[PDB]
Subunit: 555 residues, 3 copies
């Protein structure tokens, strides 16, 4: 009859409007589950999906503070359009102005307090460091808040959450594998991380990705990983993602011990992603603790095997953009890392903080960072690394004495930009492979090729090759000049060719009687002045190496 | 009974084959709506979706000239697989050859006329400027055509159109917010823009994106925005998109006044996108009118607050590719802009047209543009900007006198390429932070480090440091030479070291009696020729600064 | 009654659990088809979908060796979540260690043999070349295996396969157009290519894409094309894709003749993609055969029209990353190509192999490749090409005499990195457009600007401009030195300014009687030593060009 036919020809879906609880709907479901009414959940409410492969389509809100916990979803299950919202409207800070300047003054930040589920974030203890003095100034009702509405996927394999959004919203994958957060539809975050893959118990996380989408706000980091290892296959990480205004960092791999084990991460991808206006860092890809580090690594490689900041993290890191960080645009540690195509621009905080060793950085741009001067540098590298291509300086000036690059053990090539050379500190800087060269000078009456020996002086050029106009701009004539520093006066001693279009070489001479050791090489002469006879003499080192003094020019 | 059970266990969807009109189907719908028969609509036909959150799945065509208007869709509604097609087959031009060379001659373009819904576009008034003389030569039936089949989403929030396609097809989001055009499946455009977010009435547009996908053809721009502001969160714009053969521009933010208000745009993202073969521009990210601009900005910041081309547009612009533009590959205006990782190559038109001020450009490549010589330059910058990394010149030659870069108020570093230095015009050019250098010469008997003072001459080097082979290639010997220009003859005066492997310095002398003012510095001497005695003399400036003339070399 | 109402209000879907065969379910389907039980298929089993536009949702496996063939799907059909798995568990090799070093020794590779559907690949004949001697050492049961479970879409238009996965899995689009493989969910490959668009019969393939997703393993290439042409619109190719551990190459356009016709490809996009750890190549974008090429091109342009490797392939190639290739990171051929933003790093094999002609390469980075020294170079270019921006050398050393870049007909600008200049071979190298320059020296007592004439010597600098510290580091004094090579001894002859802070120029003289031809220019003098009188003489070329010998300095 009809019922036999109908059962064969129609798509199966249950809808939440037909059930008193979410578990009742889950139990009834076979293929589809439609969330077609707002659902108020209690923190810790747990739904058992019976191992079923379900296509969950959300067209309403899950409303609650705390965690709505999904369990026992079958591999291939998908959850689309989820919207999490807290019941509580907390107090939030908004540490930026109507012209999008960061507020750094604690009292100014306190003045921004409002009750809202968005457009700011709940203070946490990290704000006490970020805005010194704010701990004392914040009213009690703005401290210690803990509002998040979290969808928790617990101990599932092969589950994807697509187009998720919300207000004071979080997404937690706890003990999951081969799960993805795809095309996040700009959830506005709460107290906890917005997207978290946490694998502190069970097998190391693997196959876990953030792909596409974006998030805004949140008190802490937007996308974060604990105890994930993508394997040599690099099966996990963050690709195609945007984070705006993280209360901590945009993308974070955790460092150090959490609970009783390692929170660290290996072999993940961080590519094609953007972090804008994080309160702390753009990308924080470190694994070992920075300040006050642990002396051990329970559940990970021991310090005896790999010293602090020298783990073989092996992440695949490429094509990242940060703008507007208040902390550090791009931070990492590790040994033997390859990093490419990183652009950090227009940051109040520093551009890069790299606790790396035997690592290679290719095509890095650090442009107008440390704009507030809270840090000692714009890019720092601790260990012995190679930088191949480094763009420095946009349009911002720097007032004080802070370095631009401090990479004292690194070998660097390919700096471009209007960098102040006194603010470069590297182990070695070289352009070994340039072709024939031309120095083109605009807005000056001369062109210059200068030399600076940083061991002698970081602030003064030690010699130069100049070309200078003779006469007016239409003269068709210039003089070439070779100079050397003396008494810390650049260009103090020089030889000239064609000064005043004279077609001759002007040769400097020793202004008094030359000592024997003033001459360096054999078969050379050094002119010197004999004032008592109004004569030039020549100190000559003969071809055989012996010295003789001759008369060179006389009245 | 069964009907109670069936109502609970089956997915709800209505299909258009069961209804005489689209409104009848819309009214019946609860969850799904399937378009399973072709639907002929009349221009302006308007469907009211009752605030319902609908999943609209299209497996057939909407056929009609003019606009099919969708209204009152609930937040979270999705429309997938839509296919728009005109009833009319218009006359189109195809201004490119079978070898994909652009046709620029009006008569050649007229000769391409055919009736088709694709593989070309309907002429509009901008073609009269693009192909001078074409207005007179086009037959009347090819002028003033207005064929588009447009899906209009009107005054909706949170609606996504996914995998849309069509023929003579357009997509209009009018007065919408938080709407997206996702993975456009290469619709072939009509007369109007292919994808438009227009917010001239109501609140400024926000949350509106083109994400992924591609388009082809169209008479005007492929993706365009009017009166959208993404906020500091940068919630809107174009990410991951490809435009082919736009009749105007690939991606356009409108400029100036439209109707009675501003059409301008702020705080949008333009990233990870590609524009190929636009008739006009690749990316046109300007906000103020170029030619014959308005004297005011109704509905926007007044000219008194921000002068023309100096709006704080604040777009996030990164990782863009243009190839094959007939107009300008990359155009913008604004003040305080940051722009990075832009590649423009193989363009008949110019590469970049930048009416920007106090802006920063990082890692720009402009490669083989202005190949037809319709423009004065390959990259132009009007205002006082910084360029950090600029690649110029691929393999194409330039015949005439056009500049490569004309950026007269800009400070530039990091030019690479076989640029003709006479075709560089900047305020300042500098490599402040190079390491130890080597000039490697291939295919010559010498290596060179040249100096050019553009104030003196843009075409002639003013001095040089050379190394030149002595003897044959296996000699193990070279001479080093320091030269200076005189009488507009490069290398006219020089000093040599080791010419003919002689192990000595060849020193130029003044060819006649040296004037007092020919010598520059104290404790120096200048040799000069006394022909009447066959002697070298020395003009000596003593250590005390006084002059004396001495005999230097005699018979 | 109810049945009339039910037929109108419910979504149509059939499910495989209600049918004995896949064809029975296909025949019954109208809108949806759900794969809700594992289905064992026989090789060549063919399903006719009746031209219907079906949404096929897979929540179970297709299990079988050989091909499951889908035919007569309507335009707009979609297949999601498909999982292919072989019945056979073959023998696989795993030629890498637990520290992810490549195994190159045949006996070591044989020792890795295990029976598994993943974590390795079935040997094919290309392994006999890749691991010399392995053909003899492999047991017979590991040779000639042919296990793949392949979903074949045959002669369909407008079909998309989304989120596909599997074990020993392949995906074949045979004679298709406007089809896409979207967001591949890391299928683990078998013997055949993982994703193939093959159009050897019928019209040239067009509209065929791999978009997003990733694959792992496989015996041969991950994504590959035969006889596709995207048109000027560039409607096809690979965008946003990742390949891990291809048994051959990550992304491959086929070369030469297959069957009786061309397998070549034109006008495709290769962008925003990543290939890691391929056994052969990252990207192989060649069209003509490398070793032992055909003398003809049946079905393509004849050799008389375009010589070997000089086809107008016209692909759009941009923003590619390769790491860990054992073969070549990036290979191509063709004439008139534009290529940009390619990064190849940390490869055992060479970085780039470019059989290109009149082509332009912009912003290329080749970093730590040829690390095993199996190849003669890190980047090779055969023809007359332009390279604008080339980063060379990360942190790896090279022991032997292999070149870094061998591009003997190419003109290059913008090399950065710690390249050994003796390992650069180009037609011309030049930095024509640098600004005012500073050479900053760190870790030395001197700074240097060196010149090297490769025709004279590739290994020895021919001259230099130095600045050297006088005294200790706090002296405030340096000497400038201009040097020239003699007798293959760099810096053999020099002029100094300010040696020992003497404020004078030390001038080299000819150590014996100067021959007439030692002097070059008129109005110059050359000092020389007359030992028989303990005198300096001057060989003078007078302003009139005649020679005279004068006494310069005397006892
Ligand atoms: Ca004398």
């Amino acid at each position: 009859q009809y019922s036999i036919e109908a059962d064969k020809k129609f798509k199966y879906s249950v809808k939440l409007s037909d059930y008193p609880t979410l578990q009742d709907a889950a139990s009834a479901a076979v293929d589809g589950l439609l969330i077609d009414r707002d659902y108020n959940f209690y923190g810790g409410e747990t739904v058992d999906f019976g191992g079923k492969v379900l296509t969950i389509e959300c067209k309403a809100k899950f409303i609650g503070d705390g965690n709505l916990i999904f369990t026992k979803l079958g591999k291939g299950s998908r959850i689309a359009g989820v919207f999490m919202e807290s019941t509580t409207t907390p107090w939030v800070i908004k540490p930026w102005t109507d012209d999008n300047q960061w507020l750094t003054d604690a009292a100014a930040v306190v003045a921004t307090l409002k009750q809202s589920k968005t457009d700011g974030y709940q203070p946490t203890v990290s704000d006490y460091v970020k805005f010194p003095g704010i701990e004392t100034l914040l009213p009690p009702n703005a401290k210690g808040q803990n509002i998040t509405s979290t969808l928790e996927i617990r101990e599932c394999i092969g589950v994807e959450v697509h187009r998720a959004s919300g207000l004071m919203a979080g997404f937690l994958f706890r003990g999951c594998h081969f799960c993805k957060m795809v095309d996040a539809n700009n959830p506005s975050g709460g107290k906890d991380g917005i997207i978290t893959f946490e694998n502190l118990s069970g097998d190391w996380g693997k196959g876990n990705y953030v792909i596409g989408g974006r998030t805004s706000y949140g008190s802490v980091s937007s996308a974060q990983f604990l105890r994930n290892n993508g394997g040599f296959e690099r099966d996990g990480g963050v690709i195609g993602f945007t984070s705006y205004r993280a209360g901590e960092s945009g993308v974070k791999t955790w460092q150090g011990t959490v609970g009783s084990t390692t929170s660290r991460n290996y072999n993940l991808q961080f590519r094609d992603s953007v972090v804008i206006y994080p309160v702390w860092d753009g990308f924080d890809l470190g694994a070992d603790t920075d300040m006050n580090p642990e002396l051990d690594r329970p559940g990970d490689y021991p310090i005896t095997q790999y010293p602090l900041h020298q783990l073989p993290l092996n992440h695949l890191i490429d094509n990242l953009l940060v703008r507007g960080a208040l902390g550090v645009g791009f931070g990492m540690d590790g040994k033997g890392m390859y990093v490419s195509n990183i652009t950090v621009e227009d940051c109040a905080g520093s551009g890069a903080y790299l606790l790396t060793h035997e690592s290679v950085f290719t095509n890095i741009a650090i442009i107008d960072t440390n704009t507030k001067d809270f840090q000692a540098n714009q890019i720092y590298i601790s260990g012995a690394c190679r930088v191949n291509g480094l763009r420095l300086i946009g349009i911002r000036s720097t007032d004080g004495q802070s370095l631009t690059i401090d990479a004292p053990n690194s070998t660097v090539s390919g700096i471009t930009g209007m960098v102040d050379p006194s603010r470069i500190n590297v182990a070695n800087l070289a352009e070994e492979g340039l072709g024939n060269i031309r120095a083109n000078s605009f807005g000056y009456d001369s062109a210059a090729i200068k030399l600076r020996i940083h061991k002698l002086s970081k602030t003064l050029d030690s010699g130069a090759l100049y070309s200078h106009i003779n006469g007016g701009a239409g003269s068709g004539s210039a003089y070439t000049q070779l100079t050397a520093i003396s008494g810390s006066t650049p260009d103090a001693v020089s030889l000239k060719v064609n000064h005043k279009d004279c077609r001759g070489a002007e040769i400097p001479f020793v202004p008094d009687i030359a000592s024997d050791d003033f001459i360096k090489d054999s078969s050379c002469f050094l002119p010197y002045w004999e004032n008592n006879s109004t004569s030039l003499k020549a100190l000559v080192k003969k071809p055989n190496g012996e010295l003789v003094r001759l008369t060179l020019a006389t009245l």
